[PDB]
Amino acid sequence: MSSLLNSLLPEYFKPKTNLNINSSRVQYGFNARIDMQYEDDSGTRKGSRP
Amino acid sequence: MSSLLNSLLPEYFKPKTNLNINSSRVQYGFNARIDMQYEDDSGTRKGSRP
């Protein structure tokens, strides 16, 4: 059933037809922007991985 | 004039009669609590001298 397996894919994922696989290992994932924060009695230390 | 020289003294200063001076040098002043702060894009670093 193509229909039920299609709904499992994420909303942001827009797939194309061809995929040129040339190896026996693939790292599928996503890139996200994490805005980390460390608060303490002394003060706050902010970080950001884009 | 005792009156005009009396008004120059601070409000918190409550003087007593006797002062036992035993040297040719005196460091008059006051003790205060300073709450310092350093803010930056990275974060805030707070200090306190009681």
From Swiss-Prot, chains A, B:
Write down what this protein is called: Major capsid protein
What organism is the protein native to? Saccharomyces cerevisiae virus L-BC
Q: Which residues of the full protein are shown?
A: 1 to 50 of 697
Biological function: Capsid protein self-assembles to form an icosahedral capsid with a T=2 symmetry, about 40 nm in diameter, and consisting of 60 capsid proteins asymmetric dimers. The capsid encapsulates the genomic dsRNA and the polymerase and remains intact following cell entry to protect the dsRNA from degradation and to prevent unfavorable antiviral responses in the host cell during all the replication cycle of the virus. Nascent transcripts are transcribed within the structural confines of the virion and are extruded into the cytoplasm.
Places the protein is found: Virion
Family from the record: Belongs to the totivirus major capsid protein family.
The coding gene here is: gag
